[PDB]
């Protein structure tokens, strides 16, 4: 359909409330929406990082220039209906910068899907599920605060699973916070943790069993991202399911973790993996090796959460559901359509190509680099 | 689009000339074309085996009943535009019978692609290549015969690569046949062999280096299909590229071979792997592990060769090309359209959904079980 | 003795009561009895599958054609007293289809044994035992129902061991069903489970220890058939005895599991292994590696149960007994002779060649393909 | 048939010419024929060792007492048609002494076969071959002598393969003897060596490749019997086929060598393995692992060579033939029937149960302990 022009703008949307992790506190969330105009029909997509260049090596300002100045040129005037070539071309243009690469991928995928009148889900082969159990993260520094916000979410019938962010406290203090949360939300809720790399193997070995004894069903990224050998030993010595998040990056790293089953669950993240096409391949090596598939997020807006939803509904199985709470933690949206949770599950949209139209008005209100 | 009815018929088409392998001689080639009618628009696909229940555990008669009596029922009245569910449903219906499962998959994939006006290639994400270097197999029992047929194919500018079928002779006699073929077709042609499991490791160890010294670039399935450990030792002790064909079956077996690099190249075969969707996953574990991808055939007709072509054009790289000579060895076609080779390469079709319309007249002429 | 003709017919016999497994519910049981006539004396044998093409890739209709159309031809007019050649010949005729191959094997083995006036047991070298402890399976969906049927079997003095079929329930619900069965039948009965591949390693790792703590002595096929690497990790991390059932197939797969002791017990199944001759070899690699031997069934009729009995009595040791309840769950027999249980043990027959004469009258009553 | 009495006598038969090995020179060959009388029909079998207690830990005098005083008692009055029990009973009576255990096994197997009118071959399931390529061993100390005896054997059309006994010379002198034998008998004959454990790994590593370059197709037991780890390294570093002879003993040692393919070929020896029943199991673990099967001898008389022949004809494949030259090197026989070679192959007998009747007259002439 020949790409006329690929434009991109940065937009900063604040979080209703902070999200204190081990690596950074999320007071605001920056993005990069990529509008790929072609033959009259546009294609929206987005790419961004957490805590700037902290969760990953990318950030809002790096995403923009890598897109505009390095990917965009080689993509202008190219067949818009050829994602195979778009991705190949993007790999010969820049190294890494998966968020930037994924941002552009979404747009071409969205546009092509809309031109055919189908949805990203129907394009990938149709769904298998109409809704995926969403998890809620309790990352505020207060224990009482957490519990209260947690009890209400079970009442409002939207969140049955919980993801506690440990790490900012001492290994001995986080365990106590878990004795409290596990005590109250005992059987009424599911519990998971995400140490955000804070634990140094030894601390992980003595503390993982304790959390295991408290009924925690999944421990995400206990040790550092590169210590994939520790990630394995912990996995063989503990019955708990250990998920890889920061360690996952490229298709090769996915296979590297899957050889000796260094991990139990792969956390699928489009921006951390290079798009939808890249994620599917990792979900393929995970299925072959027998590793479960999750469904993470970079606390991305609706534009992202929607595309990721489309793709996750096509996965054979997500034994742990997902955590697409991006729009729900954000203080505002950049589209006219909202994603609605119904009975602890996030419902899959009913439109063509991630059924979300960018709110030009909402795009104009924030638009800062930061 | 709601599946009205899924019909299937058996058709026996002879080979212009025999294809003597290590396991069987191919005098004729039996098939099973599956016409899935839905909302007025049909969807053609096919599934079959080599030498009956010899290359695989399946055969023409087993494919028909497993399709009609076991897969078809659960698929009638189902959303025709949902391959994700179709495959899932087929896995909960029958075990194995990948040719039968792949036959039906093709049809739904074809139909859906035609309803959208795109091609199977554009559906999977668009091509990366417009033609793939086709290989010619020299499986006749005569050495002089082989060489003559080989020289003409280089002259007619259609076949630059050659696949000699060894195995029916003694290990000492096949080597001589290779001293002759390698001598004449020295630099004007590429040489590959396919022992069809005939060699018992030890014979493979002493004979593979000899063939290696004769300039043979690829040795397909030297040992038995199950002796995946021998397949590995041969691979570490020889520089030649060793390809797995019979050993490849399920996504799990693909990963099993990819862990310690038991093989150099994976031979992609839709009927042996369960369709297009299944093949893509194996092509994913191969890419992650770093194993090259080939592109085999079960000497299937145009209906098959066309779908496989659509999919192979989407693969990032096929360092050894393909061997889609199905229509070219066959004595007749079952469609109005022919696939044409141009300059040693098989060209990718220009229509919607494997651009091939079944010749009802040609379907009627053969139609025997055999 | 020169084989005159090998005939085969399909017969459908219902189950007194359903047998709900993880993969399918058994309301009826289809078979394929192979009558090999030769020099006046016949030889009966049988081959069939569970849930059609679900437990294995074979089913009633596939068994018949593979037998009649592919094995039978090459066997007609051949020396009936040469099983060595019969099997070799069958391997060069078709690939896989072990149930079909085993059906024919039984018949030639039976006939040859009858012509010598000895029994299959005496032919294989004489027995070591006169009876083997039979296990009873509790596969009905009701917990109370199970327990009641279980208590009566201990009273009637026929069943001391029990095999609970888990899988159709949630991992959390099956454990409860085991808290009940283990509670009542505590010391008066032996307990074993068969997850039928339902558990995905991680679920198996947390749940196997729980069942272990409930006194369950054997856990059959926890994970999928192909995930033989998970089967190993579970084995090293748990004291419970883990048995392989679906993973076992060919002699090669048997050795593959025996290398690093991926399993504790091999489940011997004639139809799943290719006959009596094939089973003996697997029982040989199991003895050498130090893996225990079981003695399974495909809920086959008397014809099968009898031949399997003959062979199991020759095995050096069966630490877990067998589960030849085929005739006992069936609603009728196809022979004049019945197999009788006496004091928790299934007794070995007292005739020549599986001492069972097909009831032509009973063969005529069912005979449908289904 | 109830064993009345099991008798055994020692008989010393000289070798026409000496057989100088690395461990001992064979000027004479001692035996132990075991006549098991039962219900009027006798059953002949034999057991013995090479160089007395040198090849193995057994010898003529040890075989007799272990038989008479330890196995015989528990076997008297037992069901003669129950080899399963006979072997089991023998294992609970004495430890090791496989030659003694095998001697008795042959007799019961022979008797049972004769009572049924079939042959040991037909009993085991019928043959697959009517003759097995016999190998001739050149063990005399003279090089010229060897070559002459070798040339005549090719002329008389009886021996195409040759087994040179190395070891008694220096590693540098044996190689020369091979430059001579390989030179003359170049293409007219097959060459194999048997170092009889003389080489100390390092010497084996430098010298095996040299012999390999001389066209030697098989190198039997290069290093010591216990250094099964050296046996493996040599195997991975050399294309030549390495056979295990002295290292093979029990079913467990067979599997131990088959795990990591420490050897290429297993040498089957009834006396070294505990009989026919034991040999079959080793031939089972060899088939599963993919190791080739040979067919050795302890230079045993006709009684032995005949039983071994019966069993080898039932093996799926013997890629290297056998070396049953026992009767042919001996200076006389202990039976009325002779085994005849016809066209480089040793023919399988045509009688019931090893078709050989002990020559009472010939038994009386030698009968010394020695
Ligand atoms: Cl995160
Ligand atoms: Cl092929
Ligand atoms: Cl079962
Ligand atoms: Cl020897
Ligand atoms: Mn995380
Ligand atoms: Mn092939
Ligand atoms: Mn089972
Ligand atoms: Mn030797």
Swiss-Prot record, chains A, B, C, D:
Coiled coil: none annotated. It catalyses: 2-[(2R)-2-chloro-2,5-dihydro-5-oxofuryl]acetate = 3-chloro-cis,cis-muconate + H(+). InterPro entries: Chloromuconate_cycloisomerase, Enolase-like_C_sf, Enolase-like_N, Enolase_C-like, Mandel_Rmase/mucon_lact_enz_CS, Mandelate_racemase_C, Mandelate_racemase_N_dom. Its cofactor is Mn(2+). SMART domains: MR_MLE. Its EC number is 5.5.1.7. GO terms for molecular function: chloromuconate cycloisomerase activity; manganese ion binding; muconate cycloisomerase activity. GO terms for biological process: amino acid catabolic process. Keywords: Aromatic hydrocarbons catabolism, Isomerase, Manganese, Metal-binding, Plasmid. The active site is at 165 (proton acceptor), 323 (proton donor). Mn(2+) binds at residues 194, 220, 245. Chloromuconate cycloisomerase II is highly active toward chlorinated substrates but retains diminished activity toward the non-chlorinated substrates. This is Chloromuconate cycloisomerase. It comes from Cupriavidus pinatubonensis (strain JMP 134 / LMG 1197).
